[PDB]
């Protein structure tokens, strides 16, 4: 199932633990902490980010693991579905407007395109990402070489390069391997 569990889900501040329900970033009204609603990492005002290697220090931002909704929400549903199929995780495309209840407690009510189960496009995508996260699926397994290059620069701070007489497939396998060994999926994302 998992569509039911998305729908029954609730957001807790990672600092104060106040429970909210209520944009990737969230402002805690109890403690004034700000954080990612997808991965719970901190969002830093200009220019409060403590990471010394941050090239984006003058903008409001957070650092997200590669399986945060902040990134996966840019994938097409199709591609997300492919991740899910490759790991034998079932998902809906038909319903068993939009059904998701929001605290304004009213339904989203937006138009529901074909194939997005009974949801709007944005909510369907949160469903898929929920799931991916629930089962700890690694997106990097569908990365093309260039996304793998971007990933190893973003998470390991190295610009990689093909070795001599390394074909694109081997290059890809090496980048994926190093990436999976050295950089975990989201460390605060709730898992099954
Ligand atoms: Zn804000
Ligand atoms: Zn708080
Ligand atoms: Zn995030
Ligand atoms: Zn930063
Ligand atoms: Zn919706």
- Distance, in Å, from the CA atom of 105 to the CA atom of 123, rounded to the nearest integer, reads 16
Q: Tell how many helices (H) and how many strands (E) occur in the chain.
A: 6, 6
Kindly give the distance from the C-alpha atom of residue 43 to the centroid of ligand 1, in angstroms, as a whole number.
Answer: 9
The residues with which 178 forms a beta bridge, in sequence order, are: none
Catalytic machinery residues: 23
Instruction: Report how this structure was experimentally obtained.
Output: X-ray
Residue that the structure tokens 């590669």 belong to: 66
Dmax (CA) of the chain: 60
- Residues, Cβ < 5 Å to ion ligand 2: 13, 15-16, 28, 30-31, 33
Given resolution (angstroms): 2.5
Rounded to 5 degrees, what are φ and ψ at 79? -65, -40
Q: Which helix (H) or strand (E) holds 79?
A: helix 77-86
Ligand lying nearest the CA atom of residue 101: 5
For the record, the structure tokens of 166 come out as: 């390394």
Q: CB-based contacts of 68: which residues, under 8 Å, 6+ apart?
A: 36, 38, 39, 186, 189
The residues with which 102 forms a beta bridge, in sequence order, are: 106
- Distance, in Å, from the CA atom of 144 to the CA atom of 151, rounded to the nearest integer, reads 11
> Please, what is the angle between helix 145-156 and helix 168-182, to 10°?
30
Q: How many CA atoms lie within 13 A of 188 on its CB side?
A: 15
User: 130: how many CB neighbours lie within 10 A of its CB?
Assistant: 17
Binding residues for Zn(2+): 13, 16, 28, 31, 36, 39, 54, 63
């Amino acid at each position: 199932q998992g569509l039911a569990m998305y729908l029954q889900e609730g957001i807790d501040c990672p600092k104060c633990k106040f429970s909210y329900a209520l944009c990737m970033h969230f402002h805690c009204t109890q403690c004034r902490h700000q954080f990612c609603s997808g991965c719970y990492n901190a969002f830093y005002a200009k220019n409060k980010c403590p990471e010394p290697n941050c090239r984006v220090k003058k903008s409001l931002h957070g650092h997200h693991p590669r399986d945060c909704l902040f990134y996966l929400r840019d994938w097409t549903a199709l591609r997300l579905q492919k991740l899910l199929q490759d790991n034998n995780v079932m998902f809906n495309t038909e319903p068993p407007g939009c059904r998701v209840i929001e605290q304004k407690d009213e339904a989203c009510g937006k138009e529901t395109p074909a194939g997005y189960a009974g949801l709007c496009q944005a909510h369907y995508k949160e469903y898929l990402v929920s799931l991916i996260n629930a089962h700890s699926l690694d997106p990097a397994t569908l990365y093309e070489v260039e996304e793998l290059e971007t990933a190893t620069e973003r998470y390991l701070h190295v610009r990689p390069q093909p070795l001599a007489g390394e074909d694109p497939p081997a290059y890809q396998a090496r980048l994926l391997q190093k990436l999976t060994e050295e950089v975990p999926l989201g460390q605060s994302i709730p898992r099954r």
